[model samples]
Target: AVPPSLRLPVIEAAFPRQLHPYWPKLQETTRTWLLEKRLMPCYTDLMAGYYLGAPDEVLQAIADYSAWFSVWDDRHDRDIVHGRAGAWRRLRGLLHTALDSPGDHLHHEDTLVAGFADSVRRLYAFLPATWNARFARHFHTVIEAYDREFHNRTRGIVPGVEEYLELRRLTFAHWIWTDLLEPSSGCELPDAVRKHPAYRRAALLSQEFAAWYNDLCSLPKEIAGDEVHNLGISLITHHSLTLEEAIGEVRRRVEECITEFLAVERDALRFADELADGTVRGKELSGAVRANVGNMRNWFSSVYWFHHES
Candidate 1:
């Protein structure tokens, strides 16, 4: 049961009004599969909110992909990844091929994998090579984490808060979306700028904050589905906190994440600025820095709205 008077902190980012017009269209697109599974595309608008300033095409792509993932996650819960590690790697290979080599048709017995490859093939045209590789690496790590969660759930194990947090970082795949912000905003940063310590910290914190918030919003469904590895569930099962208290703790963590993001953002921007020279590359680098900051802010606010408006 939801605790009365439950609330989330306010986010300080601007969301575009343009996204509201597209929600009904997105609902219609994703409804075919989601309806079969008895789920709604509740978070589709939240995704459009995340890439508020993206090209219309890019924004639509994000929303469609997000809806696909949500549907796929339900399928995943029903049937965990089977066969050997090589089989899973081969599946990932198909996605990587589509991402790295566009216009290639992926042959898979599983239509879901083929569909994912096709989607990536389309998205690769918008993103650059470096960003594709970066996304591929993040996605591969996420695949491993997803498999790990499968292993844990099958064994009926609920991890501790720290371990669950680490796995959540990968399984959530927020890095993949943030990487797309560069392509969407048309500003790809250099490796040094993206790999900066401060920037990486902010990036991970944003991922954690998204997970923490979503875990709270999705808690009831998770409980109904017996998905017991989330932060709230972990704290309650592993740390002896009540649901209401665990939620308060989750909010506290969200606050800390935003606080840390704010603290490191200035340094990340300064480091990016310092690395730039008086050239087009420098200007692109600067633009990437700004986009990174904006993406984090947008993600924070979008997730907040996604839950409340659901």
Candidate 2:
């Protein structure tokens, strides 16, 4: 039987699932684009629920990328299961090229590459170069993590708990999601504020929370598929725990991550105040930092709601 869903009362109450005002339009547009490109149009509603604060263009770009990545990820899983070595690598190279030069027409014949190219081009059209660079960096990490998992499965290598946690940080792709908080919330963090220790801690905690929560939710499906990269699976394999015990451990980790997130959130807010210097620019910076943190809270709740509904 499937395990019961993990409960996160604090996240649920702090950041309720709020729909974007342009959800309907975004849904229709994304669906049309995906169909036109011959890709599955899944997760439009999830994207809408995730980025409630984004404007029309930003939401559209985000939705496009979300849908594109979903299709690409599914394809990767299919390839892995079919033992198609190097196929995913080729696709990854195509995607990297597309992302690197979004304006180029080189991959126009391939719908997946073309779709990503279009989505990225739209993002670069408006967002700052720094934000685009950050997104690209995190995006590369996500793909690299996926590649690592692919090799692990093929090589019959089950990652230990420590390695699995580090890999999950990238595989969860929360880094990319968190990066989007800037465009979604219309509050780009300045370099100093973005690099502050407190902000980084809170960001990592947020990522860890999402990663463990996802492991809990996806544990059953993964086990049934004979996938061994999950946290619970790793715990059972490496720590000599039963399935039930592994589940409990994952639940505990999720709770602990959220608790630490809240603690660091307070610290981040304090730093925001400290960074403010009683001027309009300082106040703007402070507000931006708070808005970014607020968006992270929303991300946690949105992930929970998305998992429950889907």
Candidate 3:
């Protein structure tokens, strides 16, 4: 809970804002999304805090992290290669515009945000001019180029939503700038959340819990050969040149990715268990938050072997 002093401030701040603005109430799915990260380590940044939430400081690391991999995930024999890096190359360039771009208080600092734009460009030193230029613009474009020639179509999947599209742009750009900048190519985050006690208490394990919960929600469909994103479209996209090929690879790669995702999750939860209780397997705790933590472990372990192959 927030410090007692902060409680009064919270109530007082609400006085000026009596009417509640429309917003999505926090839900389990939101929590799940935070933790699971589609269960990819190469995507540790995605799980870490890149985009952090919706689109925040965490997004930067996620962008660079994923972009670096996308460059590898690109299949051979395709002339127009596009992966995370390809996307970031372009989007990083666009972020410069965002610094003073006007509209939205999205960035935490004027200097911090603008400076990233410079760093991203410098990081990608080896990108051949062609790749660099392609990298430079393709990020925002990759979300959905619509030119038909630029992107190979996913059979039944409709276009992504604008929210998704924006994610792609920022995520990609984030990587490019970071690649150009190297280790220092990251955002420090706003002062408030960074300093908030909740930030550290919160672990990616929470995200994994959320992810596993989501996977459970899809169990019926997976057993029946349905589901979307990781299980369905993403799995298909990972392996298939055509939609038909996607079917064969979904259960395999998706399962592997999820299994790996959960194994790490279990280890994290076990540690969190010890820390929260201050003992190894000792029975001691009180109140709702502790109960909630216990519940997370129970659910996290339930599907422990669901994704396992052995």
Candidate 4:
């Protein structure tokens, strides 16, 4: 059985039945790119949807936007986006402007560019100023990581285990999702509690769990494609482990990561309790901290469940 905080029902309930219309539009808009690539179906979009415990409208918007990452990634794999310096430069600038512009007003003529900017504009409806800053910072980090990976691919370099793990931290963008947890789950953590070291550790721990689990589950596909960035691949090649041995090793790592998460969470809970008697912001966060904890558990648990469920 799963922990109450990690229960699938809460995440499941957050998804709406009205997301079907977006599917056809996505297919037509992207011209069946995934189907052409013969890549896995976008079922992970459902996981993305499940991960965010926001309202129906907000969940739909976020899920649709989230699925674009796969499309963007596949394009890079096929040299459609970041592989070309001109396009990548143009896109990087456009996206930066999209997020930075007043009201997120997009000036690009391309529908793809304009649509992305539009999504950012609509996303602000659900986020407050603080959450907005959190997301923008994480989003920028993720974009930078994408560029870094593109450079690595171009140079034919495979990062070591430690470097890959650091990159995964930014690429996974778990913190951004946690930022959304406040509005999505309706729990507003105080800025002071949010800045605590223990709280930060719990966030990074959940990211490790989810990122490693993702590496574990996506191993076969990544292996088929000769993708070098995955943990399993790094272990197999860099550590000289066989596939079977690598799988076992990564499984052990995931288990240990969860254990580490528990210890940090215990620390965070104690710190949260101390904050309960502090300022008014601290009092508000004493309750909101549970939501952060729940959100963290769900972050990894939901990803783990999808590995088995999908």
Give me the candidate number with maximum TM-score: 2
lDDT tens digits, residue span 1-310, model 1 = 2244235434533332235345557656656644433444356777666665677667666666677677557656655434345654465556555555544554455566655665566566686777777877777787778778877886778999899988988888868876877777776767777778887887777778888878877776776777767898899889999877887887788777777787887787787687567788777777777766667667777776566667
Candidate 4 wrong stretches, greater than 4 Å:
1-53, 80-82, 102-107, 186-190, 278-281
Q: State the lDDT of candidate 3 residue by residue for 1-310, as single tens digits.
A: 3322112232233212111111122223233432333312223222222211123322333344343334323321133333334544343344435322323323325332333333344333333444345444544443333222223322334223333233333323333332222122232222242223332233233333334333334544653554333333453344443443443333343334334534544554454354456553233211222333332233223223222311
Off by over 4 Å in 2: 1-5, 105-107
Q: What TM-score would each prediction reach against the true structure?
A: 0.81, 0.92, 0.25, 0.76
| Tens-place lDDT digits, model 4, residues 1-310 | 4433233352245422222334334434333433333333554434442334455566555654565565556655665323586677676667666766625445466444565665566566775777777677788887788778877776767788888898988877767666766665555566666778898888788778778877877777887876778888888888998988888888778777777887898898898788788688667677677656656765655565655556
Return the lDDT, model 2, position 216: 93
Give the C-alpha miss distance for residue 83 in model 4, angstroms.
Answer: 4.0
The local lDDT score (0 to 100) that residue 111 gets in candidate 3 is 31
Question: How far is 53's C-alpha from truth in model 1 (Å)?
Answer: 2.5
Residue 185 lDDT in model 3? 20
Better of 1 and 3 by lDDT: 1
Q: Which one wins by lDDT: 3 or 4?
A: 4
By lDDT, who's the top model here? Answer: 2
lDDT agreement of model 2 with the native: 0.81
Off by over 4 Å in 1: 1-5, 12-42, 80-107, 220-226, 271-278
